[PDB]
Design a binder for this molecule. Structure first.
Ligand SMILES: O=C(O)c1cc(C(=O)O)c2c(n1)C(=O)C(=O)c1cc(C(=O)O)[nH]c1-2
Ligand SMILES: [La+3]
Length: 579
């Protein structure tokens, strides 16, 4: 919406979970800079009343702050003028039957502002348009059916007069998609599935290009066996980006259906894929699969950061993406050409490289190492030592980009995995996985399970790396003060120098941080806020109460030592400087 581009142009606000349309997570505010951020103090705090994992960030439109919670996804409206008083509250009624049909915690990744409305996407696949000034419901529409195992954890993207939403359920045999709804009415406009026939994909077989060449007819059907694409995954629970000058929205598709690759032969397109659609029609201009025929649940849903940098001496419209498979891709967001494809964790061993030789016969595909391939090791065989784990080198936590340093600040994981697939039959509403996993720190390094690194997307190198004891599940934020903020799983909100990488600030929030750090400006003064509350997959052992070491799909026993640093929580902490 034009109401969104007016909010991105106001650095005192945050009208999107992604900061800007380009998903850069870079704020122009420079009141809190590298020279005074040591003096940062807590201004005020606010508890949400909800436990489990708190992802996302609050929005601040004008002088009103909007805070969301995990299930049942309550929306608070705090009057920043009235001392953070609750002006209106939206407590939705949802079926508690929806919690067990969620892969990995009851999380919700935030709201969005458009045309005076607060857009909420509930866990039960219900899209609600709430009035920003009163909280009254403008319209409610159900995007899916949790009876079939279809939930939602992602945020929405408002573009022009439409709202594009995602759906979760890659672990429940869901044929996922992305859906555009009317902003003023909530009517369905177009629905672009990630898998299936060409009409359901909304793809031009002669004009939609993959790796520079047309995708052809039945590009996705010819890579699936029989009717298993109807339960084929490729879900869309990540972050959405948009370039208005190109009229293109970008997102990533999730894992292909079950975790047993033997019963799912073929490339399983277009799961694990970067998409580029028209917001109005849904027509894909170009498309690129990162992990063909997945064997490790390397959901390719991570954010698509749009930047304009000089590549080979030419100013190119770029697209950088830090995938779960451990590779940081740098693409031409206009054509879809893959320029760079390197590992942003040196321990990644599942593939030797991503073949980018333009006449290699394997152009654009990762060279799968047979030692760490679960399909080659076969069903009911434990593939030991695969790095990264199923949670990947980087999960839902979004990375940030600083145009001053030209670097990407990505909160990474450092966990490897034992993987044993087995055959499973599909029942609607029941999980459709077929794998028993065990996670543990990488044998190298220092025993830590996380790193906060700086990335150069034009040569594919790590400029500097900061270690972390546990994984870095919190979204990062870079500012014009040469600072980057991110939260640790032990509940620490850290600030590092954009160029050097030195820790400048560290404060203990009440719980582990899996949400994204945000900043805003009220009465002329910059504040930085973050939601605390450990959860997601890293804190599934604490959030779900699991005690088995293999429960929670391996992540319960992988983060056992997390319990001696944090409990469950639901707090928002706001920081500023002494007046
Ligand atoms: O394919 C899917 O349907 C889906 C959904 C989610 C989700 O909705 O949160 C996750 C995953 N997959 C996944 O693979 C994963 O590792 C994961 C971690 C988290 C989290 O909250 O930290 N969600 C999800
Ligand atoms: La998944």
């Amino acid at each position: 919406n034009e109401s969104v581009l007016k909010g991105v142009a106001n650095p005192a606000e945050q009208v999107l979970q992604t900061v800007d349309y380009a998903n850069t997570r870079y704020s122009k505010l420079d009141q809190i800079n590298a020279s005074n951020v040591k003096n940062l103090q807590v201004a005020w705090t606010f508890s949400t009343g909800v436990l489990r994992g708190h992802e996302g960030s609050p929005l601040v439109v004008g002088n009103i702050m909007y805070v969301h919670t995990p299930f049942p996804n309550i929306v608070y409206a705090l009057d920043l003028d009235q001392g953070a008083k609750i002006v209106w509250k939206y407590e939705p009624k949802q079926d508690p039957s929806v919690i067990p049909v969620m892969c990995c915690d009851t999380v919700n990744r935030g709201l969005a502002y458009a045309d005076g409305a607060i857009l909420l996407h509930q866990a039960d696949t219900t899209l609600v348009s709430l009035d920003a000034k009163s909280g009254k419901v403008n319209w409610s529409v159900k995007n899916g059916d949790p009876s079939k195992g279809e939930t939602n954890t992602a945020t929405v993207l408002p573009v022009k007069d439409k709202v594009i939403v995602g759906i979760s359920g890659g672990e429940f045999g869901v044929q996922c998609h992305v859906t555009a709804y009317d902003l003023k009415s909530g009517k369905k406009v177009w629905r672009g599935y990630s898998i299936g026939p060409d009409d359901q994909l909304i793809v031009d077989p002669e004009k939609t290009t993959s790796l520079g060449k047309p995708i052809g007819k039945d590009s996705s059907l010819k890579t699936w066996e029989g009717d298993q694409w109807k339960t084929g995954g490729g879900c869309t629970w990540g972050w959405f980006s948009y370039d208005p000058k190109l009229d293109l929205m970008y997102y990533g598709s999730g894992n292909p259906s079950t975790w047993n690759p033997k019963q799912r032969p073929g490339d399983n397109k277009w799961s694990m894929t970067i998409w580029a659609r028209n917001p109005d029609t849904g027509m894909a201009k170009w498309v690129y699969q990162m992990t063909p025929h997945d064997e490790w649940d390397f959901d390719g849903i991570n954010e698509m950061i749009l930047t304009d940098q000089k590549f080979d001496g030419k100013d190119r419209p770029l697209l950088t993406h830090f995938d779960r498979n451990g590779f940081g891709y740098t693409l031409d967001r206009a054509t879809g050409e893959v320029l760079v494809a390197e590992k942003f964790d040196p321990v990644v061993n599942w593939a030797t490289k991503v073949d980018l030789d333009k006449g290699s016969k394997t152009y654009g595909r990762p060279l799968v190492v047979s030692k760490y391939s679960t399909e080659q090791n076969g069903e009911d065989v434990n593939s030991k030592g695969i790095c990264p784990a199923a949670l990947g080198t980087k999960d839902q936590q979004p990375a940030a980009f600083s145009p001053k340093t030209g670097l990407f600040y990505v909160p990474t994981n450092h966990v490897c995995m034992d993987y044993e697939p087995f055959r499973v039959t599909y029942t609607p509403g029941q999980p459709y996985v077929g794998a028993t996993l065990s996670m543990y720190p990488a044998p190298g390094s220092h025993g830590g399970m996380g790193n906060f690194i700086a990335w150069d997307n034009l040569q594919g190198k790590i400029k500097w790396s900061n270690p972390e004891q546990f994984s870095a599940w919190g979204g990062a934020l870079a500012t014009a003060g040469d600072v980057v903020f991110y939260g640790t799983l032990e509940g620490f909100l850290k600030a590092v120098d954009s160029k050097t990488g030195k820790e400048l600030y560290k404060f203990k929030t009440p719980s582990g941080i899996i949400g994204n750090v945000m900043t805003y400006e009220h009465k002329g003064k910059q504040h930085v806020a973050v939601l605390s509350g450990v959860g997601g997959w890293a804190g599934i052992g604490l959030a779900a109460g699991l005690t088995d070491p293999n429960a929670g799909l391996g992540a319960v026993g992988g983060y056992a030592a997390l319990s001696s640093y944090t409990n469950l929580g639901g707090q928002l902490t706001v920081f500023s400087l002494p007046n």
